[PDB]
Design an enzyme around this catalytic site. Sequence first.
Site, PDB file in Angstrom:
ATOM      1  N   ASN A   6       0.807  -1.199   0.000  1.00  0.00           N
ATOM      2  CA  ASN A   6       0.000   0.000   0.000  1.00  0.00           C
ATOM      3  C   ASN A   6       0.856   1.272   0.000  1.00  0.00           C
ATOM      4  OD1 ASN A   6      -2.121  -1.904   0.400  1.00  0.00           O
ATOM      5  ND2 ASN A   6      -2.826  -1.026   2.301  1.00  0.00           N
ATOM      6  N   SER A  33      -7.116   6.934   0.266  1.00  0.00           N
ATOM      7  CA  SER A  33      -8.267   6.460   1.032  1.00  0.00           C
ATOM      8  C   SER A  33      -8.671   7.593   1.985  1.00  0.00           C
ATOM      9  CB  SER A  33      -7.941   5.213   1.845  1.00  0.00           C
ATOM     10  OG  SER A  33      -9.040   4.858   2.673  1.00  0.00           O
ATOM     11  N   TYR A  37      -3.386  -0.789   8.036  1.00  0.00           N
ATOM     12  CA  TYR A  37      -4.000  -0.352   6.783  1.00  0.00           C
ATOM     13  C   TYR A  37      -4.171   1.156   6.765  1.00  0.00           C
ATOM     14  CZ  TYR A  37      -7.301   0.304   3.024  1.00  0.00           C
ATOM     15  OH  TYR A  37      -7.926   0.764   1.873  1.00  0.00           O
ATOM     16  N   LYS A  75      -2.291   4.236   4.369  1.00  0.00           N
ATOM     17  CA  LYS A  75      -3.008   5.204   3.556  1.00  0.00           C
ATOM     18  C   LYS A  75      -2.684   6.622   3.989  1.00  0.00           C
ATOM     19  CE  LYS A  75      -4.959   2.416   0.614  1.00  0.00           C
ATOM     20  NZ  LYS A  75      -4.785   2.608  -0.873  1.00  0.00           N
TER      21      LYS A  75
END
Lengths: 254, 254
Positions: free
Chosen positions: B107, B138, B151, B155
């Site tokens: 990511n 995001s 996560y 982002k």
Amino acid sequence: MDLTNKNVIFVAALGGIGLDTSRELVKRNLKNFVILDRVENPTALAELKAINPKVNITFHTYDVTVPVAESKKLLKKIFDQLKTVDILINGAGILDDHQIERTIAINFTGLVNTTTAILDFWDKRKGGPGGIIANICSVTGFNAIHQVPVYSASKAAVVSFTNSLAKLAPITGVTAYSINPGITRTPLVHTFNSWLDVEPRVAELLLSHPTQTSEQCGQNFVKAIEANKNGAIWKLDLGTLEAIEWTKHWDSHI
Amino acid sequence: MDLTNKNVIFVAALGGIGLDTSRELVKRNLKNFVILDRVENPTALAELKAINPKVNITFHTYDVTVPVAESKKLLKKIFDQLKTVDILINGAGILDDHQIERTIAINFTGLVNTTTAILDFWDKRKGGPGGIIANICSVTGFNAIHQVPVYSASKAAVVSFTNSLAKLAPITGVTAYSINPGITRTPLVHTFNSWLDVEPRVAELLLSHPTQTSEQCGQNFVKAIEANKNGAIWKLDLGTLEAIEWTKHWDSHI
Ligand SMILES: CCC(=O)[C@@H](C)c1cc[n+]([C@@H]2O[C@H](COP(=O)([O-])OP(=O)(O)OC[C@H]3O[C@@H](n4cnc5c(N)ncnc54)[C@H](O)[C@@H]3O)[C@@H](O)[C@H]2O)cc1C(N)=O
Ligand SMILES: CCC(=O)[C@@H](C)c1cc[n+]([C@@H]2O[C@H](COP(=O)([O-])OP(=O)(O)OC[C@H]3O[C@@H](n4cnc5c(N)ncnc54)[C@H](O)[C@@H]3O)[C@@H](O)[C@H]2O)cc1C(N)=O
């Protein structure tokens, strides 16, 4: 928090900001101060012991880029010996945007992995007592030095991670807050590499603007630890200590 | 940006958001649409090729966790065929906070490395033509889903990196903007792992609140591409397109 008689683990205690924070911490009469850093520095250990001979100061070699199982093995032995730990400070960082993978591994993945590891011994769902994490992030996690975009993005990641830890404290028992220095004169910032050499003069230019000393930073760092505010986002800039308000751009509703 | 007769590379074009964005893009009469994805999806590819048979659609297997030298080799193959590329869209992501290292590698690190590689072909300091990068970040990079802290932190990292790429455009000739979906009904969010299983029903909870379709998202994604605003931070939430204003908490002065 009253730090008297507390047990503290400090990852990366012997760097510029680390050691000035450590000088202030040992003046607060900790019971045990456990230093985890990549390379031992006997001069610094001698200095800290002269400042306060009453503190039990110990050193373990620790590289934050090791796998999480290796961090668990080390922390298991420290917890076994001490019985309890009150505070973990995650301080490791490098500044070198020619080293993309290593910047991300040390500044972001490594902090996440030491945190994940110590939850084995603290998580209240596993029968632990909870605890407190102080993450050294950076003001560059709010607003980048865009000449070091990878470093800055690694710090944006750990500001976010620390915000989320604080919101998980009702579940884990582990509170957390971020320590975000502004520009502080240490060996990190005097010479360093910009991404794709976009700005070869980046250190010179950055240090043409106001800074604070690492002593100033360290004094405010210990004040922020004593405030002990879960979810605080502390700015330690130009010799002051201020809390910032995170902007609510979006809400998951969960 | 007039997409007529342009050459576009889209990394991770055949996932949920990707594929609906890809359907909208190939309506706009591109010259070449080059899809780089980790797995083949023969039916999606065939469907795309049927929408506008005059677009040249090519597929290359590509894992964003390869070293930067390997990305440069693949891009050299593409640039030799197409000669020019107008837009790079970096869309790779996974959502699985049991996979800490791989979350960060896909990511964050992988998006930085594809960008770093394409700068070899575009950097105006080397005689290159400049270019445009659209990064799928995001809304969780603004404000986390705190039950997937890793996560969300990854982002936050790429929101930051994109902001900095835009500010580097005068040096590199490459402009950039972020595309930040809110909760969008794809396979990513149907079932997923929370960090340390703090919330096992994190997916069920998240979809108990208003969400948008990937069709709505894809429509607004192509509108943002056509706006072509360097440094825009686009929110694509609940069917709308909205530029957000980044909060100024600190300034490097450089
Ligand atoms: C532009 C720099 C910056 O972000 C500003 C705004 C400010 C904010 C945060 N920081 C952060 O403050 C912390 C300390 O920085 P410093 O200035 O004292 O730097 P210094 O280089 O002196 O210290 C780095 C520390 O990290 C440790 N470390 C490095 N790699 C490690 C590894 N693999 N494993 C374990 N430990 C490792 C070193 O051993 C040392 O303890 C870092 O997290 C750094 O990112 C520094 C500054 C600054 N010096 O101005
Ligand atoms: C909680 C999710 C979230 O962040 C929300 C707010 C929203 C924002 C951004 N995103 C992001 O949007 C992009 C697309 O997500 P999606 O919903 O379409 O998911 P989906 O899983 O359907 O698509 C993933 C895409 O990434 C590619 N990919 C994965 N690993 C790769 C690797 N190593 N190399 C190359 N390609 C790889 C896959 O092959 C596929 O094309 C991702 O970057 C995702 O993080 C999704 C959402 C959502 N679906 O609600």
